[PDB]
Amino acid sequence: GAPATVTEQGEDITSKKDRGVLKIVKRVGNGEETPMIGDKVYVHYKGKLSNGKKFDSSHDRNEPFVFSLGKGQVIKAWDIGVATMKKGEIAHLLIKPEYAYGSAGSLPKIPSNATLFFEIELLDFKGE
Numbered sequence: 001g002a003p004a005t006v007t008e009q010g011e012d013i014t015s016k017k018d019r020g021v022l023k024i025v026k027r028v029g030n031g032e033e034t035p036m037i038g039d040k041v042y043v044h045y046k047g048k049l050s051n052g053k054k055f056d057s058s059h060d061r062n063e064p065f066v067f068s069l070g071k072g073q074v075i076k077a078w079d080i081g082v083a084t085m086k087k088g089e090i091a092h093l094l095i096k097p098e099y100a101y102g103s104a105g106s107l108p109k110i111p112s113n114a115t116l117f118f119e120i121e122l123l124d125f126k127g128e
């Protein structure tokens with residue numbers, strides 16, 4: 001599956017280099033500029049738990065997911081991950097619990113010490 005491929009070939013984009021966030025670019029973006037902290041960011045995504053028991057896509061809500069990058073409004077893996085993306089890029093991220101919902105989880109939606117997988121498309125990003 002795609003998460004296997006990420007565990008196998010994916011780049012470790014953490015600072016501590018602890019493999020808590022692994023990344024593959026699946027479709028290359030355009031431009032050279034990757035969003036700065038504070039930028040308003042527009043994405044589509046598809047997410048799932050490694051346990052295979054919960055899925056979630058922005059498309060289900062029928063609109064872009066929108067957030068301010070680096071302002072803690074998403075899990076840390078997204079702040080780190082999306083900051084590496086270009087306009088038009090699609091990436092896969094595999095995420096250990098320390099960069100997602102930790103040992104507490106977010107019950108019952110995200111269980112304790114869960115690993116997450118996302119496919120993310122970066123649509124646009126604007127200066128605040």
Ligand SMILES: COc1cc2cc(OC)c1OCCCCCCOC(=O)[C@@H]1CCCCN1C(=O)[C@H]2C1CCCCC1
Nearest residue numbers: 045047048049054055056073074075078106109110116
């Ligand atoms: C759309 O609903 C949710 C989707 C996720 C997590 C949630 O809260 C814990 C959700 O509930 C309320 C929305 C909160 C959005 C902020 C918290 O979620 C997040 O930071 C990450 C990254 C942005 C997309 C949503 N997200 C999620 O973790 C989803 C998960 C949904 C359950 C499967 C794994 C993904």
